[PDB]
Design a binder for this molecule. Structure first.
Ligand SMILES: Oc1ccc2c(c1)OCO2
Ligand SMILES: Oc1ccc2c(c1)OCO2
Ligand SMILES: [Cl-]
Ligand SMILES: [Cl-]
Ligand SMILES: [Cl-]
Length: 163
């Protein structure tokens, strides 16, 4: 575990993280995909061997000894708000199980279902609160990666609010 488990946020490419493992915002079919998933494919292509997994689940594949946790958020284009909310919560619970099993002291994590799976809605608060529900009981240092300067500020404020 970490000596004083923390949450942090950085505005940079998750493919350049400084943590002991990465969560991919994966598609269910293990395809290179777009956005975070494409950056992950370019950096850790070996981790997409037999990475296909259903919505609401996480499947870990090693790239050398570096774990890539493929976490499949719902595409809110296809799911109802209610069923999508349930699957998004579930995907983060499966990430917490994997991070615990791996015995890492730190993890790099994107906000699931906030980009091309967002169904055109701002889901910062929804996705972040599901991340917290899952990860609060873990002792890994969690570092959240985002792209947008206004998102960085809002994520930082939500972390600082609980401290
Ligand atoms: O400020 C940035 C945040 C995320 C990125 C990026 C720049 O390049 C690729 O992903
Ligand atoms: O398009 C992106 C690729 C990598 C990223 C990201 C966006 O935000 C964090 O890391
Ligand atoms: Cl970057
Ligand atoms: Cl997404
Ligand atoms: Cl973002």
């Amino acid at each position: 575990g970490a000596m004083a488990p923390s949450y942090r946020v950085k505005r940079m490419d998750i493919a350049k993280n400084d943590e002991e493992c990465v969560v991919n915002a994966a598609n269910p079919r293990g395809l290179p995909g777009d956005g975070v998933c494409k950056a992950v494919y370019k950096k850790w292509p070996e981790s997409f061997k037999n990475s296909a997994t259903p919505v609401g689940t996480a499947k870990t594949v090693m790239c050398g000894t570096y774990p890539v946790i493929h976490a499949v958020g719902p595409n809110f284009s296809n799911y109802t708000e209610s069923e999508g909310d349930r699957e998004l919560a579930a995907a983060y619970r499966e990430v917490a199980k994997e991070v615990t099993r791996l015995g890492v002291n730190s993890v790099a994590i994107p906000l699931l279902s906030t980009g091309v799976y967002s169904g055109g809605k701002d889901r910062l608060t929804q996705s972040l609160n599901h991340l917290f529900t899952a990860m609060d009981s873990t002792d890994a240092d969690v570092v959240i990666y985002c792209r947008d300067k206004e998102w960085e500020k809002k994520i930082s404020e939500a972390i600082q609010m609980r401290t």
